[PDB]
Design a protein around this ligand. Structure first.
Ligand SMILES: CC(C)CCC[C@@H](C)[C@H]1CC[C@H]2[C@@H]3CC=C4C[C@@H](OC(=O)CCC(=O)O)CC[C@]4(C)[C@H]3CC[C@]12C
Ligand SMILES: CC(C)CCC[C@@H](C)[C@H]1CC[C@H]2[C@@H]3CC=C4C[C@@H](OC(=O)CCC(=O)O)CC[C@]4(C)[C@H]3CC[C@]12C
Lengths: 552, 552
């Protein structure tokens, strides 16, 4: 049993405005202190300066975890439940808390110890009768808002903390769900010997009955500390009583808001209670934990990258483009050299626009969950990036491989096993090379509407210079095809279906320079392959360096 | 002065579950009655059955506006402020309330009477110090959440009602903004002689002090009616007192929730208070108001259809496609008959995909505001549809007319005034004909993600059968080009730049059937024009019949 006594002595916090000034108190092992105050009084700045997420020059004052300063050994026993709940919406409640248990608990334990620690906090917080329910956010409909907060508390109870610092847990709940939530926070402060500190926004009449001690901030100058049942007995002494039946938490916020008065209760506290508050004061251990962090992060996000890959409005978009492409070029003749190349350029526009546009929403949408979880240990951005690289290498190759299996034998392309699997290999390498353009642009620009416009303009300049629409490019724009991804896929597709124009010039008898300039071209088959590999790796190295630059 | 005495006698409401059963009471002229209860108790069903938005077979009971039944003459003096605020986010507070004043007040008045009635409710509700601030929703940042509710109350105060029925106005506010809001609802019930009925979710200690009468529902059986200051004096008689200092609104909801008990207070009310509650119980007048409803609705939504037309991420998407199209075909030669026709088919793909995709979000996003305002009189869906037709005829023609003015003289298209204005006329007629495909699809499918997929699949089958990519269409798919919008714009552009292939076959000397099949084609210039007009009108008649079918 390691309990924490906590004492902050005269904490100040300016920002460039004074938010906190002279806040002093103590929090004991085994008490449930609630921090009351109006909005903009400095409640949430006091919780961040106590949990340890704020230190520097803007802060001023001694914050003492068990008579000593805050070192990083204490932060493993200190939890902070922030105001917003960032959970993946397709995992169940048991799946959410088991993946967090493997990632957060140390690797000295077995996989059965770290699995029984995740089904103990399910029974502690009362999540047993929803443990197979999907979490959901607003569209993947799941657990309630009062059980979404209990999952976010269970993230911080898996490491068994001694000081649990919550930041407005009862905001947005009922009067019943917000009473039962405080009934459990009072449970694991009187039975577990913990030290719970919270900040309630507007307590009801019997939520306020459950507080051991109350700290009341006016606009950053600490009107009252002490017990909750002795709150209005102190204000009767200075001469402030309610004139009608009030909730005692309503009467306190009306003193801190100027409706009853602020300066008269600063000088009353500073001479009567603020005096005596001072009186009680390797290559198999560096590598194996990366490949286990990767293996859990890849198995966790399989369900996330399954509804953003096999969306039923994206399967329909590829089923429709297979039937249309399969009907317009149905039983096509390879001696029509102009329509066979417009088929192979439709495959290059469709499978460069569709992967690069969908990949640009991947990193903006997970910036908040990655920031909260990387700062909490739990991974190191290179096992997070390499689980998004590998997790979308596997899922994004099922729809282009089913487009081509359908529309290769109906369209009468080049018959055989080796012409089929060379066309399939070039199409899958082009989907992965163009997907990384969307990853590198969505990570450099962490907005998703500002980056869907730059990947639209880039894919339009890639298609216009890709080899088919314009044949007489002006002399100052012939360089732009060499940076184009579409130019190297389309030159490879024509080289598989036609070769070096030898059989087609015999059958056409044109050996009329139409088929010498469109089927042979400029780049070889190995220069075209080795630039689609340089754009595979190179557009994912640029997406990693973009994500280092954010700080998150 | 026309005041309303309101008495509901034994209102029941089943749904196929009993929501209301035996609710009886009276509301007097000049009292501010608040309706209390837990969530799911039938508060919001009682307000809709009293304002008049619920009547039929599911309802049972006599609802009497001033000793008589509810006729539609009384509903002009009855206002209902619903729970969610549906305001256009680019109008200022004065602009919002003046357009509502012209549309709601009768046409007997002048434009200065209906303008001074809109600056009287600004001063009444205390909106004078934000009357030039933009409203905004979350992105167009504007007035606060406590002033967004005061605009929604001012919509219903413009018709000068006698019974104002609000539905949870203080939800999502502060403790200060939700006290000042009740201080004005108590202002226009004690000074104006109105009859305000509201339903507060969780009142604070001094919000409850401002209620004249209180109606308390348990789960639909009316625990208490009477004064608010005599609420707990009645429950002391049956033997229910708080054991600790409570907010008196908290003690009442704990009686109605089973935490203190429900059936013991139904039989206490039914024999002590529910007895004695029975004891007090043309062609220039049909046309001119349409063309004035159209003229206000078109001037109101000019600012709405200015940020969805001149979005700065859409100006950049057309500026980039002008420079790319202007550089790849820079000083192009018209004897390159294959590259001149790929320029004229990129203009047909770009200006059919871009208007039809943006038009599909127009009607889904305004379904909630149109439903609330059409049911409230104020317009009739044919002056609303013809203000969206005409309001986007004007704004959507500025970006295609600036694309073409830039890239006609750099690209060296056909020189002259008559070749320029025939190419501009065909391009503007094609933008309006393809925009109506997005309007007809977004109105038949009132989702915006399910309809952006069907307008993607349709525009892909329009571009493949459009005439350039495939020449030898199989015999069962040649009909599909005649329903294509892209086929008729592209056949008109080639007919303006080349004519009936006479000068180009002389200069090429091929009179080699390449230029006989791609520049002359199938349809004439008048059949192509008169089908783009049939798709202009016909895709907007189908969008009107889709909007009748919704009921909204
Ligand atoms: C037939 C020849 C001339 C090729 C012409 C280009 C086509 C391949 C274009 C025409 C319309 C394009 C579509 C128009 C709109 C979009 C934007 C974007 O689609 C969405 O917004 C839906 C994505 C989602 O949210 O699921 C992704 C690409 C897509 C489907 C485009 C894919 C490529 C398409 C089919
Ligand atoms: C060069 C030849 C082969 C023509 C090929 C078709 C092009 C005209 C395509 C290629 C990519 C397409 C764009 C890809 C994505 C979209 C979806 C959609 O764009 C958006 O999602 C942004 C709209 C907005 O929200 O402002 C509207 C059409 C647009 C810009 C497409 C317009 C038509 C483009 C430029």
């Amino acid at each position: 049993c390691f309990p924490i006594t906590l004492k902050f002595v005269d904490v100040c916090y300016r920002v460039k405005r004074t938010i906190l000034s002279g806040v002093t108190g103590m929090i004991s092992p085994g008490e449930f202190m609630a921090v009351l105050g109006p909005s903009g009084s400095g409640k949430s700045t006091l919780l961040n300066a106590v949990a340890g997420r704020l230190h520097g020059s803007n802060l001023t004052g001694k914050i003492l975890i068990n008579d000593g300063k805050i070192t990083k050994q204490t932060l493993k026993r200190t939890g902070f439940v922030a105001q917003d709940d960032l959970l993946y919406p397709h995992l169940t409640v048991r799946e959410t808390l088991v993946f967090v248990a493997l990632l957060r608990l140390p690797r000295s334990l077995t996989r059965d110890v770290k699995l029984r620690a995740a089904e103990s906090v399910i029974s502690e917080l009362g999540l047993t009768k929803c443990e197979n329910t999907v979490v959901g956010n607003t569209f993947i409909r799941g657990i309630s808002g009062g059980e979404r907060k209990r999952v976010s508390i269970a993230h911080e109870l898996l490491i068994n903390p001694s000081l649990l610092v919550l930041d407005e847990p009862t905001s947005g709940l009922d009067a019943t769900a917000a009473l039962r939530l405080v009934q459990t926070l009072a449970g694991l402060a009187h039975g577990k010997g913990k030290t719970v500190v919270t900040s309630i926004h507007q307590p009801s009449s019997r939520v306020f009955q459950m507080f051991d001690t109350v700290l009341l901030l006016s606009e950053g100058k600490c009107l009252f500390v002490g017990k909750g049942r002795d709150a209005m007995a102190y204000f009767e002494s200075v001469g402030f009583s309610p004139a009608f039946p009030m909730n005692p938490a309503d009467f306190l916020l009306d003193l801190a808001n100027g409706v009853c008065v602020r300066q008269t209760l600063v000088t009353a506290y500073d001479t009567l209670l603020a005096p005596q508050v001072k009186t009680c004061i390797g290559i198999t251990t560096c590598i194996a934990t990366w490949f286990s962090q990767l293996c859990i992060l890849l198995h966790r996000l399989l369900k996330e990258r399954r509804h953003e890959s096999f969306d039923l409005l994206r399967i329909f978009q590829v089923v429709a483009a297979s039937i249309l492409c399969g009907l317009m070029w149905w039983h096509s003749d390879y001696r029509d050299v102009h329509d066979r190349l417009g088929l192979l350029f439709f495959i290059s526009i469709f499978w460069g626009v569709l992967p690069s546009f969908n990949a640009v929403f991947t990193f903006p949408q997970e910036r908040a969950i990655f920031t909260r979880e990387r700062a909490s240990g739990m991974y190191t951005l290179s096992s997070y990036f390499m689980a998004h690289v590998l997790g979308s290498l596997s899922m994004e190759l099922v729809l282009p491989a089913s487009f081509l299996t359908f529309t290769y034998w109906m369209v009468y392309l080049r018959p055989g096993i080796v012409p089929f699997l060379l066309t399939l290999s070039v199409l899958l390498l082009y989907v992965l090379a163009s997907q990384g353009l969307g990853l590198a642009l969505g990570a450099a620009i962490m907005d998703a509407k500002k980056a869907s416009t730059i990947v639209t303009v880039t894919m339009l300049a890639f298609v216009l210079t890709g080899g088919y629409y314009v044949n007489k490019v002006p002399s100052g724009m012939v360089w732009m095809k060499y940076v184009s991804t579409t130019f190297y896929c389309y030159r490879l597709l024509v080289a598989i279906q036609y070769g070096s124009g030898e059989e087609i010039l015999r059958m056409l008898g044109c050996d009329c320079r139409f088929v010498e300039e469109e089927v042979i071209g400029d780049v070889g088959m190995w220069t075209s392959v080795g630039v689609l590999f340089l754009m595979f790796f190179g557009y994912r190295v640029l997406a990693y360096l973009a994500l280092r630059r954010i700080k998150h």
